[PDB]
């Protein structure tokens, strides 16, 4: 029965960053985690899947583009090796999280935590014992779980992201339910390694959260690659017959049966809020079953905070990091800044070409009452894009006319995920298109296409 | 005879961008160019060499890293195809420059221009005639030429960048004189395609303009790749015997003879200031034989301007673009902003790993009297760098302590050239480490290593 200044529940990107920041500000800190050090992101999420996406990108060059680059010979690819490497990359970052806990003198507690009241946590230890832990403040960072198509269930041939990304062998065909970011990245990896792929989306666009021009471009690329995308289609039933799975879908009111060897459910994530005594601590849920928080990540209980995917605001790893810093600085009384409108935070999809965006789409800005100026620059006019061998996609910026303040930005192209930091820095600190248009960009880079769209917003695009 | 508001001499990155900007501001414009539309950059410089660097990067993956990525089979590479592609990329951008001239109603004049006085230009036409052209203002954008090792001369087996980049065949061995950016990129391409390469630098570091930590890292990578770099060595003589070239060098006062099939002279560039009547117009040269200019690119003659490599300030294509915009806005009387200290402008080297930098090195900032705070973050702590398969290099930021204003930045790693725009935007508009440290970066990207160094400058690096 020991006492800490701050206990952290869960050790993913939000939880372990918050604990470090609380250790930097002088608070005595403990972190409780039963399974994944590094949470979903480092163990079965962002990190391992980027390693697999890199492999898939090279298969797609060393086969589709071989003649163009002067590459000859019979080249084969082993997916087993790609899997072996993704697990070594993951293991290397988990070792990093343990080194960081040790460096900062954070007490790791290996177990599953449950609130006994507003200041007491009862932990069930992995080693078989029990531990009690009183605190002054607590940070809940327990993540989310996979949401299932209503009526269906998991089974041998119906799986979630976790069983797929840990499979060393591939199926002959697969149906992916959901055209979000995670679904498109599994489609992209599996199609490049010879799997027959179909993606079923309920909304009429793939990546329905992106600007409509971005959805149209990415649906064109995926069709070229050979993936079949069925939009405006509803999954009704999933039946696992052992040898194959029959997925019944409806579109335009007509029933249709698809078939594959596997089905991947990837329609979304529900916060984890059950089983660890949130009611004993008095913490209140929202109407969507998330933990409600204010702008400083504080729940309805004054000393309890909730960060990351468990509050549902925006379920990305860097958002969870930023929220944990706010939470920790708020507990210590240090200088902090709120994140603000979570629509302005960046996000990306890491198929090739990448998709990267922030802020409002053109249509969201018109519906909210701004005076909208749009500038669009294609990568066929970018010298670097031609040199790399992939000149597709574009840059599209949305701004307000009265001063030229940035409202959003939407990029599709080769590695565009790296080009967002200039844009979000200008939006957060109130730099206009006039200031941005004066920043000189190294030639030749993909980032020069940003400079061209800055000039377009002030009224004189030069190179297009 | 015919009169224009503005005549532009030379049609490279500076000249053709200035003409477009002068066309946008309402001035009637003519541009005189005998040979290269797009100048050195688009025809035999930046653009074609990036296409060759991309090819070399893929040879280096599909041979050195094949086993790690699960790539098997006998793979051969043809350098002839790489050359064919680099010439198709170049031709495609030259067609772009002509389309832009047509769109903006700029009069192209195909010939070599010579000043007759302060307002008259005599042009010798490629078609064989002569033309006279009076102007109100003139922009000189005539570029630079290769500088030769003192005492040596060009010949069959001793060449400059222009004859090398236009060679479809490769030599068995080559000695590159000069370890600047252009020399290292030719070394990198030729070594990956099986050429035996030696690079002789007079200064004691490779890339002597970079921060010493960047030079040490890049000399390690090149040694690993198999290139021999001789630093603090002086080229004395070059003798072309027909079958081989004997290069006599001295280091520590001891004479030594090297041998190769070819020698590439790549020690620098001298502005072009002879032969086209700069003395008839009254334009004054500096002591280094450049055209002198003030902060608005104006020569000692009130209506004549000089942009790009011909003024010698910083010989890069994007600098030439930025100067042409200033020049054109100054002639039209439009709102303009000077570029300022040219040391703050970004620059990059496009071998793999890239080198990217801006501003002052750590040692330059100490010698100039600042209170220097340094933050260094390695890419072995970057999750994305591990996923791509190249976790080498680092990020190093130099700042001033009193407010945390940025003084410089120095990056070596995979595609880091794209990460400079956030840094130069903060330096030009006076954003401190405190503001930068609040910008959220998409996870996982190479750019997160910037965010870590921002935290290091304000005193709390989290992930390392
Ligand atoms: C395939 C895939 C790819 C993704 N790719 C990206 C990407 O490229 N970029 C991106 O930004 N995001 C990506 N994500 C999302 C990212 O994984 C999550 O947004 C992130 O992990 C959320 O962080 P968190 O710490 O809030 O939650 P988690 O990472 O889920 O952390 C929760 C942790 O708390 C533990 N826990 C739960 N209950 C308790 C309890 N009672 N006591 C103790 N511990 C408990 C859990 O075991 C878990 O380890 C991806 C996700 C998936 C599935
Ligand atoms: C191999 C190589 C790689 C390079 N890579 C890069 C890179 O990655 N990034 C970068 O920023 N820079 C790079 N550079 C440098 C870049 O090419 C130059 O900085 C740039 O071209 C300078 O632009 P400019 O328009 O001032 O000169 P130029 O491009 O040389 O333009 C001068 C033009 O004027 C014409 N001209 C000359 N005299 C007259 C006259 N009397 N009348 C009419 N026309 C005339 C010439 O024919 C020529 O076409 C590279 C250079 C080389 C050689
Ligand atoms: C010095 C330098 C040179 C280049 S550039 O070499 O790429 N170039 C000359 C531009 C170009 O090509 N424009 C163009 C213009 C027209 C077209 C077209 C392309 O594509 C095919 C189609 N058509 C036309 C449009 O109706 C059909 C740069 N690009 C960027 C960026 N971003 C910065 C930059 C800086
Ligand atoms: C959520 C998340 C996760 C990761 S992370 O997965 O990469 N990770 C856990 C950090 C890490 O590994 N630190 C580390 C710590 C130690 C070490 C080491 C590495 O390398 C090998 C050597 N040693 C130690 C140092 O003495 C030997 C992130 N990195 C970035 C950036 N930039 C942002 C980011 C955000």
UniProtKB/Swiss-Prot annotation, chains A, B:
Protein name, per record: Dihydrolipoyl dehydrogenase
Subcellular compartments: Cytoplasm
Principal location listed in the UniProt entry: cytoplasm
Free-text disruption phenotype from the record: Cells lacking this gene grow, albeit poorly, in standard medium with dextrose, glycerol, and fatty acids as carbon sources, but fail to grow on carbohydrates. They are less resistant than wild-type to exposition to mildly acidified nitrite, but are more resistant to oxidative stress in the form of H(2)O(2) in vitro. Lpd-deficient strains are severely attenuated in wild-type and immunodeficient mice. In contrast to wild-type or DlaT lacking strains, strains lacking Lpd are unable to grow on leucine or isoleucine.
Outcome, altering residue 386 to K: Reduces lipoamide dehydrogenase activity by 91%
An example Gene Ontology CC term for this record: plasma membrane
MF terms in GO: antioxidant activity; dihydrolipoyl dehydrogenase (NADH) activity; disulfide oxidoreductase activity; flavin adenine dinucleotide binding; NADH binding; oxidoreductase activity, acting on NAD(P)H, quinone or similar compound as acceptor; zymogen binding
EC class of the enzyme, as a word: oxidoreductase
Species assigned in the record: Mycobacterium tuberculosis (strain ATCC 25618 / H37Rv)
Function noted in UniProt: Lipoamide dehydrogenase is an essential component of the alpha-ketoacid dehydrogenase complexes, namely the pyruvate dehydrogenase (PDH) complex, the branched-chain alpha-ketoacid dehydrogenase (BCKADH) complex, and likely also the 2-oxoglutarate dehydrogenase (ODH) complex. Catalyzes the reoxidation of dihydrolipoyl groups which are covalently attached to the lipoate acyltransferase components (E2) of the complexes. Is also able to catalyze the transhydrogenation of NADH and thio-NAD(+) in the absence of D,L-lipoamide, and the NADH-dependent reduction of quinones in vitro. Together with AhpC, AhpD and DlaT, Lpd constitutes an NADH-dependent peroxidase active against hydrogen and alkyl peroxides as well as serving as a peroxynitrite reductase, thus protecting the bacterium against reactive nitrogen intermediates and oxidative stress generated by the host immune system.
Record keywords: Antioxidant, Cytoplasm, Disulfide bond, FAD, Flavoprotein, NAD, Oxidoreductase, Redox-active center, Virulence
Disulphide bridges, residue numbers: 41-46
NCBIfam families hit by this protein: lipoamide_DH (TIGR01350)
Active site per database record: 443 (proton acceptor)
Amino-acid positions noted as binding FAD in the UniProt annotation, renumbered to this chain: 33-41, 50, 113, 309, 317
Keyword Disulfide bond attributed: yes
Gene3D superfamilies to which the protein is assigned, alphabetical: 3.30.390.30, FAD/NAD(P)-binding domain (3.50.50.60)
Pfam families: Pyr_redox_2, Pyr_redox_dim
pH-dependence of activity, as noted: Optimum pH is 8.0 for PDH complex activity. Half-maximal activity is observed at pH 7.0 and pH 9.0. Activity is abolished at pH < 5.
Signal peptide: none
Activation/inhibition comment: Triazaspirodimethoxybenzoyls are high-nanomolar inhibitors of M.tuberculosis Lpd and are non-competitive versus NADH, NAD(+), and lipoamide and >100-fold selective compared to human Lpd.
EC number: 1.8.1.4
Cofactor: FAD
Cofactor note: Binds 1 FAD per subunit.
Cell inner membrane keyword on record: no
Gene from which the chain derives: lpdC
Family (UniProt): Belongs to the class-I pyridine nucleotide-disulfide oxidoreductase family.
């Amino acid at each position: 029965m020991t006492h800490y200044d701050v206990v952290v529940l869960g050790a993913g990107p939000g939880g372990y960053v918050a604990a470090i920041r609380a250790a930097q500000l002088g608070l005595s800190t403990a972190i409780v985690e039963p399974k994944y050090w590094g949470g979903v992101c480092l163990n079965v999420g962002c990190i391992p899947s980027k390693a697999l996406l890199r492999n898939a990108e090279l298969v797609h060059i060393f086969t589709k583009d071989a003649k163009a680059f002067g590459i000859s010979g019979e080249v084969t690819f082993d997916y087993g090796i790609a899997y072996d490497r993704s697990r070594k990359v993951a293991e290397g970052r988990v070792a990093g999280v343990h080194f960081l806990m040790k460096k900062n003198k954070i007490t790791e507690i290996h177990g599953y935590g449950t609130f006994a009241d507003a200041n007491t946590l009862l932990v069930d230890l992995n080693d078989g014992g029990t531990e009690s832990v009183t605190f002054d403040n607590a940070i809940i960072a327990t993540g989310s779980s996979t949401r299932l198509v209503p009526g269906t269930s998991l089974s041998a041939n119906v799986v979630t992201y976790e069983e797929q990304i840990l499979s060393r062998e591939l199926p002959k065909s697969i149906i992916i339910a959901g055209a979000g970011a995670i679904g498109m990245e599994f489609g992209y990896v599996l199609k490049n390694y010879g799997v027959d792929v179909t993606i079923v989306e309920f909304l009429p666009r793939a990546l329905p959260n992106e600007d409509a021009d971005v959805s149209k471009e990415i649906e064109k690329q995926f069709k070229k690659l050979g993936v079949t995308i069925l939009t405006a289609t509803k999954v009704e039933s999933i039946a696992d017959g052992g040898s194959q799975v029959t997925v019944t879908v409806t579109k335009d009111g007509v029933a249709q049966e698809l078939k594959a060897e596997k089905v991947l459910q990837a329609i979304g994530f529900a916060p984890n809020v059950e089983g660890y005594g949130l009611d004993k601590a008095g913490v209140a849920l929202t109407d969507r079953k998330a933990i409600g928080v204010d702008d400083y990540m504080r729940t309805n209980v004054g000393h309890i905070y909730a960060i990351g995917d468990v509050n549902g605001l925006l379920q990305l790893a860097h958002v969870a990091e930023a929220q944990g810093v706010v939470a920790a600085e708020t507990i210590a009384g240090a200088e902090t800044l709120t994140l603000g409108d979570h629509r302005m935070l960046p996000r990306a999809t890491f198929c090739q070409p990448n998709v990267a965006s922030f802020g409002l789409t053109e249509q969201q800005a018109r519906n909210e009452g701004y005076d909208v100026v749009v500038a669009k620059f294609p990568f066929t006019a970018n010298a670097k894009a031609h040199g790399v061998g992939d000149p597709s996609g574009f840059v599209k910026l949305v701004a307000d006319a009265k001063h030229g303040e940035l409202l959003g930005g939407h990029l599709v192209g080769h590695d565009v995920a790296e080009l967002l930091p200039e844009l979000t820095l200008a939006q957060r600190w109130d730099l206009t298109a006039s200031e941005l248009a004066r920043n000189v960009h190294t030639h030749p880079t993909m980032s020069e296409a940003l400079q061209e769209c800055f000039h377009g917003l002030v009224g004189h695009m030069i190179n297009f």
